[PDB]
Here is the input.
Amino acid sequence: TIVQELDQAGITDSGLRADYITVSRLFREIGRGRYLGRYMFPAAKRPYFDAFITFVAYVDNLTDDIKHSVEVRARRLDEWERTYLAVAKGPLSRSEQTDAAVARALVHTLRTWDLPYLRVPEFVDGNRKALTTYEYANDEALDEFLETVTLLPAVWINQIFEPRSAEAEELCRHTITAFQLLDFIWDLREDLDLGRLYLPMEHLDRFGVTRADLDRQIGSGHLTDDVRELLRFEIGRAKKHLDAGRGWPQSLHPTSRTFMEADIQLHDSMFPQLTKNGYAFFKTAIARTASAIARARKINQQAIRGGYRVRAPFQ
Ligand SMILES: CC1=C(C[C@@H](C)O)c2[nH]c3ccccc3c2C(=O)C1=O
Ligand SMILES: CC(C)=CCC[C@H](C)CCOP(=O)(O)OP(=O)(O)O
Ligand SMILES: [Mg+2]
Ligand SMILES: [Mg+2]
Here is the structure.
């Protein structure tokens, strides 16, 4: 339980403990599948994993609340950022209550791990900019999204994973880039329906494809050779990044390897789903997790018997 994990982490402040408890329950609500990854980490690290993942998912969710206007979503980002900065520098609606718990846990997590907690607004600004960006002219323009929304939190959580070599950050950047590019491809139909194109226009031009072509053909039952070749190209670009980043687990502390090995393997499993049966994925509309938890429990206890201990909390 989070209470025993907080005990093992040495987090004793009753106000802070309550915030980590709130965040852990929120984490479970934002997705049980992702929440279970916490059990691949040493018990005393799970409060930090909870707080960091919840922060990224919580803020990204503010940005992708497609029920509401871009103006409303922008206001929510401003609200969370104001609350974060108030906490960082030392009746409530439900969103105000969660904003504050997420912020308080995150500040403590970031300071515990020697991360630049005052730069969190750069991540929020990337999300604010993404709200009003519906197209990307080329790779350089898409990098404005990737280097703020995607990879800034990625290089931060890399430190929480306890890198053993300097190559870890580049492997982290390749791997999470591949994950993000696969998300764009997987979600192409939904994103197109929202008026957003995350495939750079230069790539479309290269294969003679228009945005209208994609809008009309994805989910239509058929694909022209040009559209299929564009999809093949984008899938191959994601594959190349994943292959370049695949050594990331070995560059991390042993207690972090099982989680990222499982996550890489999950994304590996997306490639045949996208392409099989002649790209049928684009024409029409638990076991791995249990095994990884089993493997992680062996590795983590080994590491403990070898003297491993999670660092002391910021206080
Ligand atoms: C640590 C991590 C991360 C890093 C994140 C916690 O900042 C991640 N970012 C993503 C963007 C799109 C699709 C997947 C990811 C992921 C992960 O799967 C992951 O494990
Ligand atoms: C999954 C993780 C460790 C952190 C969350 C980063 C981001 C939220 C994942 C994208 O996956 P996803 O749930 O599909 O978001 P999306 O709907 O596409 O904007
Ligand atoms: Mg998506
Ligand atoms: Mg998605």
Summary: The chain has 16 helices and no strands. The first helix runs from residue 2 to 9. Residues 146 and 186 are 17 Å apart (CA to CA). The pocket of AO6 (ligand 1) is lined by residues 53, 56, 150, 153-154, 157, 176, 179-180, 183, 263 (CB under 6 Å).
